[PDB]
């Protein structure tokens, strides 16, 4: 049977790769020594439970708002006027205990199988051990009750307004409960600043009755049992062997299961894949080559004509080495057709290239994982684009492909000029007679972009619709064909843009933002069947600036 007790997972052993607790039973649980806490039963022997100080108990932290990274990876749809959807995390910890184990004798069943395997130096056998008993034991861990909530805002603007609205009306109440207050009360009203806000919570261990920051209507509880939150320290199970012969042989079998998919031995830095780990094309397949997830840049919203993309390097610390990232891109309108092919190594770092595409490599969250990025600066406005990415290892395997599809923004529209043209056109149509008027009316309407034409229509109909609609009146004064040529131009504007271009007012802000521009100093030595490691390529990185003109849409000019 399964011996379960509180604190709990400390005595059972932990796998690093699969991240699972309760893997076999490493240490024995006994009840000779008398360890109690509060309302909890008798603790197992040799584990030290220390409640965290009153400063840490029932404290909540609101994170800074950031774009929703989940919504920047696939088919990327978001309102251009809104911007990136934002998320903000709220987290409250309540029933906290720090749990260490010292000192405990080994389990009966653990030492039995440890006695028989010690002499029996076998690979398939040592892996079956790790499957059952895991790789480490947990040394230090944090238990308690945490409520983690995520507030999903539809835009960066909508938050800022709500945060400032909250900050005015509070100066008592947490930000999340103020929002939840207005969310639940909205059954009384309808559309407002809070329209698209959503809160999503996930609890690990139920909220105690005493703590008021994690209280949710039905779910309160008197003295809840603490749940594992963090694993602070792990120690490998080869510490427990007590002899130099087996604990070296076990260690190498552990490294095989972690780094080389259990189908190969690890030489310093790389996996020697035993045959036939090798794939369909006969290339070493024991170390996994992961899918690189192509993302939109969180800090740079794509404009019309300008898109910048990111991805985190898929290279493990040990095993596979990535030699290149292949990045294809096309404009759709097609399907299953190949876009312009770009080798990161060869086309983006080495061959210009510029000033339309630029690439960059940078140090990530915690080094050393690299953050590759590429920026497209000569794309076409109101266009749907598909970008795909895959990695290529040192021996020539491709990774699983990854995709991003997105629309570039609407083209810029001088809204003053549009309303001016509309009046010019109306006064010509009230002039009637002249063939110069007719020609010059037709010329000015055709000379300006389709979006501008759609906007002059919007204005023309706002004012002069009672005396004849824009198309109808264009047909009367310019004749059947010229009016149909005008009409057709308006068809070239998309559904998204035509919606946005019916706004009350359009204004133009100009953001100016930095991007990393890197070039290859050193052309690296490549073989026929093996290639050079991309990460080792010496590069010279310079910061540059893009100016990004955007339209700003609204029902009035006060934002
Ligand atoms: C869970 O589970 C598990 C448990 O355990 C875990 O696992 C782990 O992990 C970790 C992390 O990742 C790891 O660690 C790591 O490792 C790695 C690898 O290592 C190895 O190898 C290497 C290599 O080398 C090379 O080079 C050299 C020169 O010097 C030579 O010698 C050699 O040879 C090589 O080469 C190669 O080979 C050949 C030739 O012959 C050919 O093929 C070619 O050439 C190639 O290349 C090394 O280095 C090492 O070594 C070590 O050890 C030994 C014994 O064993 C000794 O003898 C030595 O001395 C050493 O030691 C020392 O040093 C080192 C360094 O410094 C250190 O570490 C130590 O401590 C001592 O001191 C081995 O063998 C590595 O690489 C890494 O490192 C890195 O990273 C870090 C962080 O982490 C840092 O700090 C450092 O610095 C580095 O960095 C660098 O690099 C990188 C890479 O790429 C980059 O990126 C950066 O930038 C820089 O530059 C580490 O260390 C481990 O191992 C593992 N373990 C096991 C058992 O498995 C996991 O993790 C977990 N998980 C979680 C927690 O999550
Ligand atoms: O020492 P160099 O000039 O870089 O070249 C090495 C050489 O081409 C080896 O044949 C190759 O192993 P395989 O061709 O057998 O894969 C090795 O890969 P490795 O160092 O990643 O094992 C290369 O690094
Ligand atoms: C349960 O604990 C006993 C010690 O009383 C131990 O002998 C037994 O093997 C444990 N069960 C498992 C599955 O480890």
Numbering used by the authors: 717 to 887, 897 to 1058, 1063 to 1288
Quote the original article.
Although most of the crystals diffracted poorly with a high-resolution limit up to 3.6 Å, a native dataset with higher resolution (3.16 Å) was eventually achieved by screening a number of crystals. For crystallization of ASTN2601-1288, 200 nl sitting drops of protein solutions (12 mg ml−1 in 10 mM HEPES pH 7.5, 150 mM NaCl) were mixed with 100 nl of precipitant (12% PEG 20000, 150 mM KSCN, 0.1 M Bis-tris propane pH 7.5–8.5) and equilibrated against 90 µl of crystallization condition. Although we verified that the expressed protein had remained intact such that EGF repeats 2 and 3 (EGF-2 and EGF-3) were present in the crystallized protein, they were not resolved in the structure, presumably due to disorder, though small-angle X-ray scattering (SAXS) data indicate that the domains are folded. The crystal structure contains density consistent with an inositol triphosphate species being bound in a shallow pocket formed by loops from EGF-4 and the β-hairpin slung across the Fn(III) domain. The Fn(III) domain (β12–β15, π1, β16–β19 with the start of β16 and the end of β19 tied together by a disulfide bond) follows directly on from EGF-4 and has the unexpected feature that it is complemented by a 54-residue β-hairpin from the ASTN-2 C-terminus (β20–β21) that folds across the Fn(III) β-sandwich, clasping the edges of both sheets. As such it seems to lock the C-terminus back to the centre of the endodomain, rigidifying the structure. The annexin-like domain is positioned between the Fn(III) domain and the long β-hairpin folded across it (β20–β21) but, functionally, forms the tip of the ASTN-2 endodomain. An annexin-like domain is an unexpected feature of the ASTN-2 structure (α6–α11) which despite undetectable sequence homology with annexin itself superimposes very well on an annexin single repeat (see electronic supplementary material, figure S9 for a superimposition).
